[PDB]
Design an enzyme around this catalytic site. Structure first.
Site, PDB file in Angstrom:
ATOM      1  N   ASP A  38       0.758  -1.237   0.000  1.00  0.00           N
ATOM      2  CA  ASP A  38       0.000   0.000   0.000  1.00  0.00           C
ATOM      3  C   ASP A  38       0.794   1.297   0.000  1.00  0.00           C
ATOM      4  O   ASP A  38       1.406   1.636   1.013  1.00  0.00           O
ATOM      5  CB  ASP A  38      -1.010  -0.080   1.150  1.00  0.00           C
ATOM      6  CG  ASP A  38      -1.820   1.154   1.456  1.00  0.00           C
ATOM      7  OD1 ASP A  38      -2.256   1.836   0.502  1.00  0.00           O
ATOM      8  OD2 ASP A  38      -2.097   1.389   2.639  1.00  0.00           O
ATOM      9  N   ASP A 218      -2.934   5.423  -4.781  1.00  0.00           N
ATOM     10  CA  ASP A 218      -3.083   4.484  -3.657  1.00  0.00           C
ATOM     11  C   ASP A 218      -3.287   3.056  -4.059  1.00  0.00           C
ATOM     12  O   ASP A 218      -4.404   2.639  -4.350  1.00  0.00           O
ATOM     13  CB  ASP A 218      -4.214   4.975  -2.717  1.00  0.00           C
ATOM     14  CG  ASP A 218      -4.316   4.295  -1.351  1.00  0.00           C
ATOM     15  OD1 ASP A 218      -3.582   3.304  -1.116  1.00  0.00           O
ATOM     16  OD2 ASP A 218      -5.115   4.767  -0.509  1.00  0.00           O
TER      17      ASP A 218
HETATM   18  C1  LIG Z   1      -4.592  -0.252   7.971  1.00  0.00           C
HETATM   19  C2  LIG Z   1      -5.905   0.105   7.618  1.00  0.00           C
HETATM   20  C3  LIG Z   1      -6.147   0.776   6.404  1.00  0.00           C
HETATM   21  C4  LIG Z   1      -5.077   1.066   5.518  1.00  0.00           C
HETATM   22  C5  LIG Z   1      -5.363   1.878   4.238  1.00  0.00           C
HETATM   23  C6  LIG Z   1      -4.419   3.135   4.171  1.00  0.00           C
HETATM   24  C7  LIG Z   1      -4.641   3.963   2.879  1.00  0.00           C
HETATM   25  N1  LIG Z   1      -4.656   3.028   1.723  1.00  0.00           N
HETATM   26  C8  LIG Z   1      -5.700   1.972   1.736  1.00  0.00           C
HETATM   27  C9  LIG Z   1      -5.373   1.037   2.924  1.00  0.00           C
HETATM   28  O1  LIG Z   1      -6.355   0.012   3.073  1.00  0.00           O
HETATM   29  C10 LIG Z   1      -5.880  -1.322   2.849  1.00  0.00           C
HETATM   30  C11 LIG Z   1      -7.076  -2.204   3.225  1.00  0.00           C
HETATM   31  C12 LIG Z   1      -7.362  -2.412   4.587  1.00  0.00           C
HETATM   32  C13 LIG Z   1      -8.440  -3.210   4.985  1.00  0.00           C
HETATM   33  C14 LIG Z   1      -9.226  -3.842   4.012  1.00  0.00           C
HETATM   34  C15 LIG Z   1     -10.283  -4.679   4.423  1.00  0.00           C
HETATM   35  C16 LIG Z   1     -11.118  -5.252   3.465  1.00  0.00           C
HETATM   36  C17 LIG Z   1     -10.889  -4.998   2.096  1.00  0.00           C
HETATM   37  C18 LIG Z   1      -9.818  -4.193   1.670  1.00  0.00           C
HETATM   38  C19 LIG Z   1      -8.976  -3.604   2.630  1.00  0.00           C
HETATM   39  C20 LIG Z   1      -7.893  -2.788   2.235  1.00  0.00           C
HETATM   40  C21 LIG Z   1      -3.753   0.709   5.890  1.00  0.00           C
HETATM   41  C22 LIG Z   1      -3.509   0.048   7.111  1.00  0.00           C
END
Ligand SMILES: c1ccc([C@H]2CCNC[C@@H]2OCc2ccc3ccccc3c2)cc1
Ligand SMILES: *[C@@H]1O[C@H](CO)[C@@H](O)[C@H](O)[C@H]1NC(C)=O
Length: 332
Positions: A38, A218
């Protein structure tokens, strides 16, 4: 002796066009995790064996099975618009492709069911800058750069349509996954994978971002996102309707939907309806989901648009750390 001549590829799995994940190894012997790479976050985290809801359905890091582990214990909270995890800091050796790095990472002990029940991956490998790292923890890519192994201080993303799910290249780009040449856009500032956007067109007319706006590139975001205000105008131009979680159109109207173009650098990056509609049916009696949603990203990063998997599937993306720029080439 270290030479700057390595380009390491990481194979990604595409789960339903919303989650792109690969494998990393933590510890000695290595404990493997499915992770989202990410660019919108700067910390590495995996669920911990010390965890309690979503921890039951994922792989857990056990420090007691690792000879290379170094205790830290500092409390860590990662808060985002998508979700919030909490835990503590630990140090261990992380292998990504063929690169091995000593990394300070988060052992997650608090994983909420929403949205972590929906996650097919275990953790997140933050590809962002130190400036946005929580606890000022040196990000993985900075530790890889320090090694002096990479052919170039870049990393690239290929996201396939749902067969290789995708691929991340550390130290370069894979010319087998794009066509033509890259067009580059400098970052507004170092510290965030964000560039200036000059306008967002629906059809042939510049409907949105008329006075300019920001675009976060992103890799961890599933969809293209815009502010509530921008998405309301976009959805009204598309004739889309808000169901419980997503925007939908009547399936028969899906293929007729207009092109959406993002004016970045000196070029328009166009998504056709085929790129942004989950065209699971052509029936007039069925509802089709759009891979676009609203997200009010808070300062310092936001207010901003976020170009996620919807955008990356169309455009092979290169994140260039040496030159503080992002390059796009049509994906293949
Ligand atoms: C912890 C939570 C969210 C994120 C974000 C930070 C900005 N970019 C998007 C990322 O989300 C990744 C993510 C997290 C949980 C998810 C749960 C279900 C589906 C997709 C998902 C994608 C990073 C770390
Ligand atoms: C944890 O690591 C950080 C470096 O990122 C350090 O400043 C801190 O003092 C360490 N804490 C312990 C208890 O080792």
């Amino acid at each position: 002796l270290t030479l700057g001549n390595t380009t390491s590829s990481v194979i990604l799995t595409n789960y339903m066009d919303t989650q792109y994940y690969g494998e990393i190894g933590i510890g000695t012997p290595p404990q493997t995790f499915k992770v989202v790479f990410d660019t919108g976050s700067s910390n590495v985290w995996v669920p911990s064996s010390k965890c309690s809801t979503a921890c039951v359905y994922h792989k857990l890091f056990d420090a007691s099975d690792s000879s290379s582990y170094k205790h830290n214990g500092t409390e860590l909270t990662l808060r985002y618009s998508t979700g919030t995890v909490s835990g503590f800091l630990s140090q261990d050796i992380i292998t990504v492709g063929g690169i091995t790095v000593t990394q300070m990472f988060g052992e997650v002990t608090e994983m909420p069911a929403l949205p972590f029940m929906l996650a097919e991956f275990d953790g997140v490998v933050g590809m962002g800058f130190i400036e946005q790292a929580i606890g000022r923890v040196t990000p993985i890519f900075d530790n890889i750069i320090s090694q002096g192994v990479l052919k170039e201080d870049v990393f690239s993303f290929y996201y396939n349509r749902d067969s290789l799910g995708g691929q991340i290249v550390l130290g370069g780009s894979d010319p087998q996954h794009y066509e033509g040449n890259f067009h580059y856009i400098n970052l507004i500032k170092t510290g965030v994978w964000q560039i200036q956007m000059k306008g967002v067109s629906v059809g042939s007319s510049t409907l949105l971002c008329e006075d300019g706006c920001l675009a976060l590139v992103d890799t961890g975001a599933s969809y293209i996102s815009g502010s509530t205000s921008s998405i309301e105008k976009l959805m009204e131009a598309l004739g889309a309707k808000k169901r419980l979680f997503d925007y939908v159109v009547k399936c028969n109207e899906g293929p007729t939907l207009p092109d959406i173009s993002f004016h970045l650098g000196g070029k328009e990056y166009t998504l056709t309806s085929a790129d942004y509609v989950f065209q699971e049916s052509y029936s007039s009696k069925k509802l089709c989901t759009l891979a676009i949603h609203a997200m009010d990203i808070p300062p310092p990063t936001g207010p901003t648009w976020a170009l996620g998997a919807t955008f990356i599937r169309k455009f092979y993306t290169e994140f260039d750390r040496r030159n503080n720029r992002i390059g796009f080439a049509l994906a293949r």
